Amino acid sequence: PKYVGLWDFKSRTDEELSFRAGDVFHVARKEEQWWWATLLDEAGGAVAQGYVPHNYLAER
Amino acid sequence: PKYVGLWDFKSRTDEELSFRAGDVFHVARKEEQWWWATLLDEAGGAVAQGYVPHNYLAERE
Ligand SMILES: [Cl-]
Ligand SMILES: [Cl-]
Ligand SMILES: [Cl-]
Ligand SMILES: [Cl-]
Ligand code: NA
Ligand code: NA
Ligand code: NA
Ligand code: NA
Ligand code: NA
Ligand code: NA
Ligand code: NA
Ligand code: NA
Ligand code: NA
Ligand code: NA
Ligand code: NA
Ligand code: NA
């Protein structure tokens, strides 16, 4: 979908993208739909990593 | 922050992570607060790409 910038942003890394308030962007739906996550075991320890659907997750 | 899975999920690709309803996850702000975006010019043309904090963005209306 299409988005507008609300505030100026200064990138810190080369991969980040600086912009100004009012700039317009295209963002693919997949960026909101997929999250890299760490699965925790019953003791709260990391046991797996991978992409999971954002919307299969709820705040704990 | 921590999250809970609402339904079982079967990964389709190697990079996806299978899980069960009720599993608990850590998801970093450095992951989910950022989207890869394409900056556009006034004619709708793509002019730059990179990670942006998505909460600095509002859907256009
Ligand atoms: Cl998101
Ligand atoms: Cl993906
Ligand atoms: Cl990653
Ligand atoms: Cl585009
Ligand atoms: Na800023
Ligand atoms: Na993705
Ligand atoms: Na949901
Ligand atoms: Na929050
Ligand atoms: Na289920
Ligand atoms: Na599934
Ligand atoms: Na994926
Ligand atoms: Na996997
Ligand atoms: Na992200
Ligand atoms: Na693009
Ligand atoms: Na113009
Ligand atoms: Na938000």
E strand or H helix that includes residue A51: strand A46-53
Cα–Cα distance, A27 to B30 (Å, whole number): 18
Cα–Cα distance, A60 to B26 (Å, whole number): 10
Residues with CB under 5 A from ligand 12 (ion): A 50; B 17
Q: Which CATH number fits domain B2-56: 2.30.30, 3.40.30, 1.10.155, 1.25.40?
A: 2.30.30
Contact B34, A54 (CB under 8 A): no
- Smallest Cβ–Cβ distance between B40 and the set A26, A38, A44 belongs to A26
E strand or H helix that includes residue B11: none
- Based on DSSP, count helices (H) and strands (E) in chain A, helices before strands: 1, 5
Which residue(s) pair with B25 in the sheet? A39, B3
Alpha helix stretches (DSSP H) within chain B = 29-32
* Closest to B56 measured CA to CA, from B40, B27, B33: B33
In angstroms, what separates the C-alpha of A15 from chain B's closest C-alpha?
A: 5
Cα–Cα distance, B58 to A6 (Å, whole number): 7
Cα–Cα distance, A2 to B38 (Å, whole number): 10
User: Which chain B residues have a beta carbon less than 8 Å from that of A11?
Assistant: 50-51
Contact A48, B26 (CB under 8 A): no
CB atoms within 10 A of CB A14: 7
Which residue(s) pair with A38 in the sheet? A49, B26
Cα–Cα distance, A12 to B50 (Å, whole number): 11
Written as one letter, the residue type at A31 is: E
At residue B45, what are phi and psi to the nearest 5 degrees?
-85, 140
Question: What are the sequence ranges of the domains in chain A?
Answer: 2-56
Provide the experimental method for this PDB entry: X-ray
